[model samples]
Target chain A: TVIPIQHIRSVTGEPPRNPREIPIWLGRNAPAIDGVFPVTTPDLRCRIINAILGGNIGLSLTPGDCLTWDSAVATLFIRTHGTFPMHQLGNVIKGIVDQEGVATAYTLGMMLSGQNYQLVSGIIRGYLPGQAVVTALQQRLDQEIDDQTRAETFIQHLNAVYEILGLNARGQSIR
Target chain B: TVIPIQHIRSVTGEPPRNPREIPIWLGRNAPAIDGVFPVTTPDLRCRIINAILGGNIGLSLTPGDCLTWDSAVATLFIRTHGTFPMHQLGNVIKGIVDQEGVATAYTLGMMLSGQNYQLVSGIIRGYLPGQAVVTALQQRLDQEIDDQTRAETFIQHLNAVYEILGLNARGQSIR
Candidate 1:
């Protein structure tokens, strides 16, 4: 029985050795708190997508369809009413999964896709603003686990994001 | 010569006692931090308006457009996304003028009218999340002032709020 958990701690910034009892504040500069780095190239986009989906969420993309973090981050930015930063939003998507676990992260992602700020704020209320969630997720990313569970979680997350971004411009479902 | 500083501390929750070296956090439950209370009666609305305008920010309401904390609190409940205890929100308005003095309070109130969440969040960012600003404002409110300077400061703040709220909603001009 092999469980792969290396990425978990790294993603959430949560340390494997000693977990923080109190959630740390994700600094003002945190990507998740601020926004996501712009996807400049297809390769980079693929990598970012992989990082998100590699966690085991599902989405569909096609060779001809145009989708980029640029699009997604923009959508989120407008929805959050320009509060979220431009280059750090992806971290928020990734970090949520790492800290709160896959299900909650997917839900938050859905809210982002729908552009719901109040819900996001309300859901993440107890943590120390930005830092806590990010650190918690980082810690989760660092832990290792088996491939199967990882894949399943990643698929679930992908599904969530894909659903949100359903039907690429080329008329292909993200799933 | 006596300075009528009674409302100064009472409104802003600032005290005349030794001023606090460090700002205190306004608790989540703090009226100012949360949301404004609803106005219940027409009479009450007038008073609340009087309190705000008494601080010297102008607004339009008929003699019959008269309102009260009770009625205003009620109106706020229907208007704001969530319920902010009516009494507390009033304290927040008064407290700001009391501590930061009248200008800041009116400015904050203008943001509230526009439902400007970002502006609100930015203004409230420091002071230990919830408690700090409230305490700082309260402390500021309590300090005694020579009338000459106090009126001058109040006018400065009023002008500041008026400037920011200028020409947005109706192009009718808040100034």
Candidate 2:
């Protein structure tokens, strides 16, 4: 099971205009899986650019905008849930894939199966902030790795970060 | 209990460029119960217009937009699930409230509380295609109603329409 973890190679040569027009990889042993292909992660920068460029959002992905995959799970999700479902599930994978075996297996599944990449490619269209979650997750990973903590330690650290900072307290938080 | 449907009125005072800029009705006495205000059946017309104009998208909403109470369901779902719950629930409600009761109450709940209305008014930030299920329901209603049926064979026609149509797809059904 594989989803495009790399930012640059998420879409399978699909335009981001209208119906998202991205190619999706459904089978195992796709080309991008062999080598960690970088995908174009969503972000404020890209969003600002897209907004400025009017509706030609996928302009950067022109000539060859596509998403590849190699994940059975993604395939099942896509077949059962369609592009939208796959996109959502893939984003989840991107969000919390730091739980050692679980995260590794999930990302690996996406990497191998080509199904994991469906989420961001499609979801990025609906996403307003554009890659805010992805960026946050990346920052978490960076912090955890830099702090030199194992999975358990990473969990604690991440929890502390989320409680203290990731989310804003609407009502009240004593701690 | 209440979904804040009447907040739309407050936003309607001044046309905002971004629908999300539309203020929410937070005070009491917003939704008047048992009041016979004009109720428009949910449809795609308003959503399509706003979206094409780039007025709103993705949880951003404004005044003069279209929605039923079902929009709140999506917010609850997305809150528990994650971002982008596919607008399935909200879209379904919008479609159903136009002609029927089950969905009507759901949307009415929003009207009663002003919660659902506010959420949808905000969620209308982005433009997406209308759901197929609602569209199908509309088509069925169209086929079942006409002038002759509205004038003559009233009681039997009501029963027939109910049996055949399943439920009030919306108040929009003509017979």
Candidate 3:
């Protein structure tokens, strides 16, 4: 099923302010789906980007932005599990497809629906750095790092990062 | 075991930017514990403030900033789960304790941590309102309010809030 990820807006038309604003594909005159789309291979990222750019859909990415289908997952997570599950993802995706076109939907569908959990977590961690984690990571990268003493501190912060994404140490969803 | 919620900061000497920047108690000349401290109660909030105010500890809250032990939790969440979880609630709490006393920890602990998944979600949603959700909620709150339709929307948003805290639909930890 092709589920349009919600909360993610088409930066192809209007650019987004937040880095979390994931871009997607929605072609003109195409039908839309409301369920989780198949997870695409890592190779699809370039293809989707190429499609959006080649298609002349006016979407642009600012620095620090990455593409992902997880926006839909994030959207799904928010819609289904967030404090406010407004299904805004579904409605927004539907709105985009209906208003933009099938091309837009297809493009966005690939962008929003194809991302896997690991890639999503990395993107999220990169985008959302906890101050403590960043410090620890920085320290770990540095020679001044404490190996034994600060191990707990580092682990604690790392755990926090996983928690932020609703994942456990294994990066699996606790739910 | 007193696991010092690691991300809190003491504002007794430095002061904080807002209520969210919780103030805690660290007794003067006492060795700081690195473990999470037992959660405190509401009564401590006032006592800490009164003591700080009376003891001439440079610490002070902008009136109406009073809250409690859970500030550590919230601070920890922010420090770890927060995009910039660098503000270790522990250090901050330690700072406050060193600058003030245990009373401060008791008060701020509750303020930061007492906030449950629901309240935290509402606060976050308020701060970062997805344009679509905001509009929908506004619309729902308006005339076409469906006790049933809105119920899903409400549940959706609530679910989003839960997800934000890494909780599932049943408000259980997904991790």
Candidate 4:
């Protein structure tokens, strides 16, 4: 009885740099642009932030830096991951999540999915005026997070939020 | 006096007998179950009328009986369905006996009665009228289609409704 009322669904996900060794990943696909933009119902905040940060992911990547990633395997294996051992960004991420909420952490992380990679004179940069909340935690927490440390936080926050979104009650994929 | 458009019907079987058959006039490619297809719009669309009877008419009653009040029907018929075969004539209606107010509705239904053909044998399978409403609904579904399998699927939907309705069984001699 159904002659294909046949509508369409949008794909939601993050994109890794050049599809490979990417420092950041997220908002890689969108609706209107039809590629690399994670389009969803025009509800929620990151809508604006992602707009400001799009293309926009990873404008900066520095060295001697540590970052964490999600390997859902961590849940069952009773372990988690990061680049530099004991590099603690999660605690600050927790502070923001408590201050703002989980959605903000996820939204901000999702927006940060793409590394803005803007480096000059050996200082990492991808900070924008309104990129305040996550950047607020970057208030000289450590390193040059004003530059480098900020990117690390982005990775950590994204890792925490993603560790969740990339999963489901049963079978699910984050990337 | 009720000049009687006298739109005819059957007592037992169905109506397409034309009361005769002759040469095939219009397109041969109908959506299978829709009998002799005549899909076109109407305005001055009796051309559709003629298409319906292209050869499928003359058996049940003459156009004269229909022509008295039917001239509007006829005049109304040919001017439409300018092209695209059945599209024009069909936008005229829905359902074999939709769930209506209008002369053209029944008028088109009448034309379909002959089942768009004449059947019998020398000795005779005898002459039995075939159902025409399904033809109108079915054939035109094909015609209404944006213009292929889409046409085929349209026929598909109507056919599904039929299997259900035919729980009682039905379409038109008026078609």
TM-score for each predicted model, relative to the true structure: 0.23, 0.19, 0.20, 0.16
Cα lDDT tens digits for candidate 4, A29-97: 222232333323332112222222222221211111112222111111111122221143344234334
After the best TM-score superposition of candidate 3, give how far the Cα of residue B51 lies from its true spot, in angstroms: 25
Candidate 1 lDDT, A1-175, residue by residue in tens = 2112232223223322221111112111122211123334555444443343333323323322225433343342343345544234445655654444444443444434443443343343333223433454334333536534442354233333423444221213323
Candidate with better lDDT, 2 vs 3: 3
Model 2 lDDT, residue A96, Cα: 28
Chain A alone, TM-score per model: 0.22, 0.21, 0.21, 0.18
Question: Which one is best on TM-score?
Answer: 1
Candidate 1 to truth, TM:
0.23
Instruction: Assess candidate 4 and give its lDDT.
Output: 0.29
| Model 2: per-residue Cα lDDT at residue A166 | 27
Among these predictions, the greatest DockQ belongs to: 3
Query: What does the lDDT read for residue B131 in candidate 4?
Result: 56
Writing each residue's lDDT as its tens digit, candidate 3 over A1-175 gives 2112221113323323442233322321012221223325433332233222221211222212323443332332332332322234344445444444322333343344443323322233343224554564444534435443432343445555555666543334689
Worst 10 residues of 4 chain B by lDDT: B3-12
lDDT for B136 in candidate 4 is 41
Docking class for model 1 is incorrect
True contacts kept of 4: 0.00
Interface Cα RMSD of candidate 3: 23.7
Candidate 2, residue A11: Cα displacement in angstroms equals: 39
